[PDB]
Structure 1
Amino acid sequence: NGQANAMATVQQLDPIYVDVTQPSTALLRLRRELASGQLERAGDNAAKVSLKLEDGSQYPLEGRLEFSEVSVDEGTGSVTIRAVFPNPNNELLPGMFVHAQLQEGVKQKAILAPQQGVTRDLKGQATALVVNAQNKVELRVIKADRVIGDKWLVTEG
């Protein structure tokens, strides 16, 4: 009566939960940029987009985000985010290590330079070659922080 170890386990596979982790340093930085910095707002498209499996492939169905853990653990300084995903064919199993991409704000008046136009010289320091009004060429040190698709989201320069 009331012994510790189980004798079997029953489980439901539809729907499925995805517990991702996010560092709180990138969580309050989002709240800092969401009011004073590069202003942005998602809207009704902040439900979710899909996730990425173990082999790097993409899941066909997208999920939904409802939050479940406002608490920072001491070892890593990271909060936990819960998401619910439909699993009609049991392609997802409990315990799999996955990568879910969430939705940050929507940046307006964003500048996206192509990959071949940007280079990295000595001391790192990502730069590009521009043409001014006198048809000269200049080198501009830019602050390219992330890649979106086939472009770099450049924020200065």
Structure 2
Amino acid sequence: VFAELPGRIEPVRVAEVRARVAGIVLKRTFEEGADVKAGDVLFQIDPAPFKAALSRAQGELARAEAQLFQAQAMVRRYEPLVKIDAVSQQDFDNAMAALQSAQADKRSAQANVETARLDLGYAEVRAPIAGRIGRAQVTEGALVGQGEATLLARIQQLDPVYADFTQPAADALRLRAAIAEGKVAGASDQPLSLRVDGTDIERKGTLLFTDISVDRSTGQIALRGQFDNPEGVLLPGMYVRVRTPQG
């Protein structure tokens, strides 16, 4: 027995490229509708403050490095002297403690520099995943990142796709009861068949997930199957009818 359930096509990965920092979009570095790779630069936001913050962090790092160099020179000079008692053991220990403190300060300054650098890199808006990028929600010269994360673009993965379809809970309970009684055998291994309305395009798939929760407004459970889409024929959001085996 096959049940033809309504469902919709949804892409496996959706990335809403949003602005993480406030600033003017100086440039758009992609053509809308093209395929983008992970890490490709899509939007350039004007880095006016973050460059200055990076400069401040680099200056602090340079100061820490200078203090570390002074401590290293002091320790190097004091090391042969303590072996001939030329300096007190307490002075050598103080110098070594100063050297360790300087190393810790250099590490802290490097951490600050890396934090500032990542903050700056959060202005070269790079694609988090590979896929097809849609229309740009903002244009060049628009102010983004002020207050909320302004949606810049959307990237979708078109292969494979999921079909999210819906089945009545009473029918599922009846099928489960018939399985438990033994009147019907479980059809978990039979492939789902997706059909596009108005066309002869048929696609085979596998049942991935069956929901445990019942939708309160309608009383039906949601199910998710996976369908291969090599030709890109199945577009996200399309209404599809999924024939699923009922045992």
1:29-77 C-alpha deviation (Å, 9 max, x unpaired): 111222227x12145742x132110215341x31111115211111111
Residues 1:103 and 2:245 are matched in the alignment: yes
Distance 1:88 1:49, change over 3 A: same
CA-CA distance at 1:93 after TM superposition: 0.3
Distance 1:101 1:43, change over 3 A: closer
| Most deviating of 27-36 and 78-87 | 27-36
CA distance in 2, matches of 1:23, 1:86: 26
Give the SS at the match of 1:26. helix
1:63-108 C-alpha deviation (Å, 9 max, x unpaired): 1111152111111111100001000010000000000011111xxx
Distance 1:28 1:42, change over 3 A: closer
Quote the residue 1:57 is aligned against.
200
Contact in 1 for aligned 2:160/2:226 (Cα 8 Å):
yes
Contact in 1 for aligned 2:159/2:229 (Cα 8 Å):
yes
CA distance in 2, matches of 1:70, 1:82: 12
- Whose relative contact order is higher, 1 or 2, with alpha carbons under 8 Å and at least 6 apart? 2
CA-CA distance at 1:4 after TM superposition: 4.3
Give the SS at the match of 1:21. strand
CA distance in 2, matches of 1:78, 1:9: 30
**What does 1:13-28 align with in structure 2 at a 5 Å threshold?**
13-28=158-173
**What does 1:7-86 align with in structure 2 at a 5 Å threshold?**
7-36=152-181, 39-42=183-186, 45-46=189-190, 48-59=191-202, 61-86=203-228
Quote the residue 2:151 is aligned against.
6
Identity %: 39
Contact in 2 for aligned 1:16/1:87 (Cα 8 Å):
yes
Q: How many residues align?
A: 102
CA distance in 1, matches of 2:197, 2:212: 27
Query: Unaligned stretches of 5+ in structure 1?
Result: 106-157
Structure index of larger Rg: 2
CA distance in 1, matches of 2:150, 2:220: 31
TM-score by length of 1: 0.58
CA RMSD of aligned residues (A): 2.0
TM-score by length of 2: 0.38
1:110-155 C-alpha deviation (Å, 9 max, x unpaired): xxxxxxxxxxxxxxxxxxxxxxxxxxxxxxxxxxxxxxxxxxxxxx
| Most deviating of 23-32 and 67-76 | 67-76
Q: Residue 211 of structure 2 aligns to which amino acid in structure 1? A: E
Give the SS at the match of 1:71. coil
Runs of 4+ residues over 3 Å off in structure 1: 42-45
CA distance in 1, matches of 2:240, 2:220: 17
